[PDB]
Amino acid sequence: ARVTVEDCLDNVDNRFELVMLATKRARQLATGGKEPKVAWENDKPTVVALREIASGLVDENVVQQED
Amino acid sequence: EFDAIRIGLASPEMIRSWSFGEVKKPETINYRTFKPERDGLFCAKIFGPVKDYECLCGKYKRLKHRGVICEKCGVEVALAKVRRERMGHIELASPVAHIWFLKSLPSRIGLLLDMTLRDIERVLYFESYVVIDPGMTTLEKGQLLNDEQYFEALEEFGDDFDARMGAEAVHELLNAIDLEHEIGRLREEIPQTNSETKIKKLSKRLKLMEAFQGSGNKPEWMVLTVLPVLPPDLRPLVPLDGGRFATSDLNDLYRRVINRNNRLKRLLDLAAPDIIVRNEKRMLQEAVDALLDNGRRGRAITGSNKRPLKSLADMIKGKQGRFRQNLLGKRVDYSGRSVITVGPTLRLHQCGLPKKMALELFKPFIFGKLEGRGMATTIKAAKKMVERELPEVWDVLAEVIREHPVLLNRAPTLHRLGIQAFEPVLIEGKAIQLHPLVCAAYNADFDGDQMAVHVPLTLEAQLEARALMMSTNNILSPANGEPIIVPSQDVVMGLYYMTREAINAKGEGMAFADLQEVDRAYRSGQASLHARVKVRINEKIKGEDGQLTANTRIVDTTVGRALLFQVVPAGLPFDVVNQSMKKKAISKLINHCYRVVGLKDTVIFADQLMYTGFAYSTISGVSIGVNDFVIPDEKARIINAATDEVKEIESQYASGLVTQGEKYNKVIDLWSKANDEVSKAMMANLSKEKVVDREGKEVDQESFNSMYMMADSGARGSAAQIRQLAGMRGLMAKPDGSIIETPITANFREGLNVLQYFISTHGARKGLADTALKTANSGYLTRRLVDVAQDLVVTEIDCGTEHGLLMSPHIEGGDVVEPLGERVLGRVIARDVFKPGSDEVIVPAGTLIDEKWVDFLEVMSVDEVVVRSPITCETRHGICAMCYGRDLARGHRVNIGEAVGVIAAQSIGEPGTQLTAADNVQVKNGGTIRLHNLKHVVRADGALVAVSRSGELAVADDFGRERERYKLPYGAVISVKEGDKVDPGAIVAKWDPHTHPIVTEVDGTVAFVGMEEGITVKRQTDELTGLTNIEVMDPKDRPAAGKDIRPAVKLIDAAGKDLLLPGTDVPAQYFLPANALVNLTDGAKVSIGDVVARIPQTGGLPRVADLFEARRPKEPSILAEISGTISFGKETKGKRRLVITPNDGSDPYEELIPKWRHLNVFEGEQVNRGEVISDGPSNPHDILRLLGVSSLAKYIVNEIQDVYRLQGVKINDKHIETILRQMLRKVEVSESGDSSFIKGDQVELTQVLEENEQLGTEDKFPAKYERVLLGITKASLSTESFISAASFQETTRVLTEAAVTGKRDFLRGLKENVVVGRLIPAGTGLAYHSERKRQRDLG
């Protein structure tokens, strides 16, 4: 329910590529071409993007195929 | 976009092509109308229109034509921004030289001409002459001549001579200089001499010659005959109130040089004589010098004022020194300053924000939402409805408040935690509510300052801000392993008054069912917060990875410890919360639970702990009162006894027994003795200030008053502050350098008089002076300290080389100062560790030291650990992430792209505002003795005499770890033997800083050779037969015949055979220096090791500046060059020529020593390289010549940590290790063949040059190098950049160096990329830079 980046920081231990991944996910959400996986909880696309990053549902190859 | 950011020298023709027209009139604005004319400073034909889409005559006012030219005026109609694209030019009939190449600290014309600055300025001042292309003449082109000398040279030659003067001769010699062919003579003459002053000029000459060769630009392009004009939109001309105008001084100087060039044009066409064209060219020289700079030789003044005019240097820089206009001030949009306040009802993941600024900081977001939802598609009605305060604006605005980050930065910036990220809410009022637990990270108490907010526009910046500076990410401080979120006094007083061991209360010995049942029982009103009760705990342990076993434990916890484990979740044990809840205790607790659970559970535990601490502070009832400060009755007795003692001191001083200094030292240590005596008495009466009893007469415990609680907690303040409140205030010292002998007989409770307050105000004003100057001094040092460390990017994952550097704990003094676990936390291991057994390896890999490895090495007895340091890395232009430890905001390892140098400099720049003999060696704890690099010999009586002054006394413990380290000088006596039992407080080593004995190695009879009674020795007899020995003479008091004679006591056998020491061919003959006394006469049997003769023997801001500048102090320490035998050479020749004659390799060179410095070198001693001789400190650069890198780095981290430990802060050694690598990055060479003899380049360039030359045609084209270490004001001047160095250095020197350099630099660095606003390499720009490298010159 809250913004938690620890679920990705303890998984990938990188803190660099998830910014670009959530960037591309938020751009695909704001462009209106890709639907979000997790439902909206009265948030902006940033929270949905970081939740899809921390849940491990979208990756680099998945975002490249979605582009 | 753009690439290849280089600097090259340009021809006047390409300056003409960059120009758009020639200016020849001083017309700026007309006197009739407010419209400028043509051919002026504000012309429309050359630059463009003053308005948008209009012409100068006013014929075309449409929007269609963008590149069309009018018929009446020769201007091009375009936008209003095209005044900031086009420039003009000024035609120079005689070319004028550039004074930026001359008036700087180097004068490059004098170095390319092998001249000085005086003659090359005198030829511009039209006082001396200069000739070009002499050929067959007596004087060459580099000679000087006066007017009569040039007339005689023209008369004696007639032809083949051209005598010019000014800057056209400079252009002629720069045309006919042949810089591609003149470098060969310099390269041939460079090995001919081996000077210093001449070789420095030859080295900078070959440097500028190689720069002209690799530049690809002609040297004649320095002098210019086409000079551009400033763009007229950068210099203001606007109508003011009342028909006035607002102009800059650059308009005035450019108009002045325009009029002077017009007068030159009107004077050149009348067959003018030589004197007036010399005067006019000198006038144009001073005119263009006033154009480029101000305040050197022109000193031009304006009308009706006293301030000097502003040149183009004040347009490229402005004010505040030699810093650029984009670097001096940058007002960023979407900002605004406000005052802050604390909000305690908000979580860590949110904050408060008032609606009056929330209507404007979210203005493009509310415009997009209002135009997207479908209520108002316009923007002017949107502005009207957000300025009319409608009812629906909050309902349509609250969608971008809940889940939208904001930035907030303090306007005095101290560290990296001053900027943060939070989530606003919708409140009332005008000021901003903040999180309580982040003001300690801000270092900003709520004192009513001005804090500005920032809102980034795109949502990508919001996502990365919530990734980088959201408060659930930067929990750990960059200084050490303590968190930057520090609990303040209210939550720690809540945990202090909550958990307590009480004697008498209501409900003593009761039983509680569970934790929440205890919470119900405490709040009923019959149970106390502190009582001896009993309760079971349903605790869970997270020791196993992926399983939390449930178990109960019966412990003797109180009500408060049960309510403390009520808020603490099931990720912490119940035994760790059984202490007294001090500040450092709960800091270690929050660091431990952070390290074991990560980030989210830590930050959700933080708000719940803050909430229960706030509630338990609200329902608490402590206060500091008049009965809180207990005054003992023995304090007045101590004051009266010490007053009688100082009256005795004054009477015995007035009677005429002692001097002022002895009684002064007596009072300044006895008053401090009384001070800490009444201080520990204050601790005693503050600890024993509680009278309680439970079914008994009396019972003593800890006191239940707020002063003792804040003393034991230690949130803000220390134990030395309550002495001023209750006991004796202390001994404030005078700011002149002395101390005041009269004490503070009263206190703050009873009331001070005038005199004691007058003593206290001097120290108060001194402390105010230190706190006022320390902020400016810390800013002034950090403005270069982070400036040198802005090129520490990470671009490599794992190199593969095997190096490292040993890290030793601070064991100076009696006990250990810094522990081992407080220095290697978060670090990575370089090689395998060696157990004291046989073939026992813990781990053969470079794993990260986590929270388990620290107690794993604490259970072990290893102390000499080697971590992977970046100071011995193999990467080029950066630092790999495998060398850097885990000392970051995260808990895991660092990754690729982290700028590790700026945090390394900020961890030093942050606590910079908080700052202001050897008679016997005794041990403190019982430990074994360990000899480390010391050569000693046993004596006949049983003592141990050490002749090596490089040896250190290491006191190893019972396990084998070193807990105490001592320094042993030469000639010291070691009473204890190696490999013996331990003894606490015993004497292990004894040395006199007073006399200096001379121990011997062989035995037998002695014989003094070269001793004369009157020249070398003298029979001195004291009064009443007090001294009967042989007194030697001084070197200056001796005669002229015995001045070069040196005595030497030859040691031989008793039978008459020659006795020599083993190892060397020379016998063991001891010399007789001055001021010595021989105890034993010649011809007597003397044992080995006996004393032959007796020879008698700041801190803070400027200290850290001197160790960061790497410069020598006022009195440096001189060390011996090569390890081996140290002998004396010239004595009365003017200096001390301490020669070095080793056994392996002898060198003919000998280091010099001044006669003012004291030399403690013994004649004939085996002085190694690590042995210090002279008193005072040795700089890092100076040390870097004998030993190497490791001893220098451990000396640097020791001399940093000893001064940084006394304040209270803790800084890891990596934060200075990376900047030491950065200032060690440049090295020098000492061999030609591929480069010159003396040149300073980077070590990575020399490494790749050696790697390119080792595999090629020849065998070994490259040679060896030499490591030199630099400071923070010259390591950043050896960079290959120009605009990164044009911010802190003078632009007048670095721009001329770049202009003569011609180095095609790339976008490597950070200042080159933050001066323009393109993609930064350090960070998330790795994908963009890899894409640019893939699409640029690659397939």
Next chain:
Amino acid sequence: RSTGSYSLVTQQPLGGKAQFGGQRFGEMEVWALEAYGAAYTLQEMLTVKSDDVNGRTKMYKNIVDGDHRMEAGMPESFNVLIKEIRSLGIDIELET
């Protein structure tokens, strides 16, 4: 202040349009900004919030229309620097 009128020597906002300006984003602010390992906000706050010509227009059009592309473009700070450097006659070209 959300949007302020830019200056005459560069495209940085300032007062005088009946609105007070922002704070000084000097050296220590951007130093604390690049204290962490990030690179995108450092150029976003330097080419979108100030020092551009058409970049703020295309970014506002991307905000209004909704779709994001993040075009790089060319800032005007490089233009002010190349004019102030070519005023001294200095050859600067691009290889590409």
Next chain:
Amino acid sequence: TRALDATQLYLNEIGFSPLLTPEEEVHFARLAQKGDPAGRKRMIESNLRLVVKIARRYVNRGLSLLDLIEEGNLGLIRAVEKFDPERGFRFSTYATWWIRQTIERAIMNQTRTIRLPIHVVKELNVYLRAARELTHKLDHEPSPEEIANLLEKPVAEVKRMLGLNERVTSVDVSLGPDSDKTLLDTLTDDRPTDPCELLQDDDLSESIDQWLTELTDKQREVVIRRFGLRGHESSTLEEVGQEIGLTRERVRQIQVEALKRLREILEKNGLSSDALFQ
């Protein structure tokens, strides 16, 4: 050591200027009339004491002393260039009058940023001279009313003449000795350079483009062709009589009813006079 300056060097260089009897200057003026590059050189290199004596009187001005000695020798060489020796008098007074004209031109062209012709700076000079004469007997601040009463001129005329005297100071010398902030970042430009203004411009352009595309075709054509908004020139119904409509009254009624339709759809869209023009 030695002095690294220019004025001292100039003063040491002009020490070799001879001062003979007037017959030498008469012979030099006679030789300069026929044409020879020796008499003009001697007259330009032997008559600098009067030049520096003229330049020493005009000190403490908006120029430098090198400019004063340069206009002095420029006026001297312009005097001896077109010099007529038929008068038989001394040319020192002629060079003095030429140097006075050159220093008047230097005051006119090298003092204020706004340039001025001869007559306006002459009436400014006599007006400031009259103000200097009257302020000694007035013992107060000079007001334009007494100057207009003394000079027999209207008050608005002399107010407009004194309004040209701007006397602009520097942009770095701020108020007070501590110049922590200059005057470059204080005032802004008068033109619209805010992103708010250009943003409102492009949003209003897109809004009226959508409102013209949502209206009728003939109304959008007569609204775009008349004002020149949607890719049209600066032509009207008198120029579009052979393009859209022949009768001017018919297309004028069409234009005013299209403006009434635009006003009523702005009223129904939430746009009024008080919400647009404050």
Next chain:
Amino acid sequence: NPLGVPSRMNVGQILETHLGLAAKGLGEKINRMLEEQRKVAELRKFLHEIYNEIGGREENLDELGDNEILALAKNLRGGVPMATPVFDGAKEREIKA
């Protein structure tokens, strides 16, 4: 907050708030004394027992009862001021009294 006394080295916060509590106690006492409608003899005895402490001096038995006593009552019902010097001010025992 009780951090202002140990960290900042000023214990005058506690002494000033104690004298403020005493002054408001005396002010509420003279306010309820004026409310209780007592005679002027009780008011002058009240001023006598106020102005006869250990520190300072007494300036009583000078003011008239009808004008000056009512004037000081109406102008001291909203609190009373103290007069302490800087380095020889009020001791603690008069504050305890």
Next chain:
Amino acid sequence: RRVSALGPGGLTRERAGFEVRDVHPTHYGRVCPIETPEGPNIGLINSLA
């Protein structure tokens, strides 16, 4: 009653150092060191007793 050391013929803020920012005990009743503005200038701007 402000006693400032700045202005013409005096020491400015950068010219103070550690010389004029300290007090001598000859100021007994003359210069009060508990009256100076806080910020970038403490010690050189004094007050009158």
Next chain:
DNA sequence: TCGTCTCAACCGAGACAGCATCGTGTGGTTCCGTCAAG
């Protein structure tokens, strides 16, 4: 007997009048945009 190695000052930062065109004010008609009138 001379080349090179320190070594202490030097400098700079955080008037008057006349002559030859001249450029927009000042209308001058003329074209245009609009206002009644059927």
Next chain:
DNA sequence: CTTGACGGAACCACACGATGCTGTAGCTCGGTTGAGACGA
């Protein structure tokens, strides 16, 4: 759907000074450079 009248631009001739030119003759601390000193 037609017709005739007035106020406001729109180049343009006339013009009134007005631009433009010309002749009288008495604090702490780091890079640079000139100068003394010692050995091969």
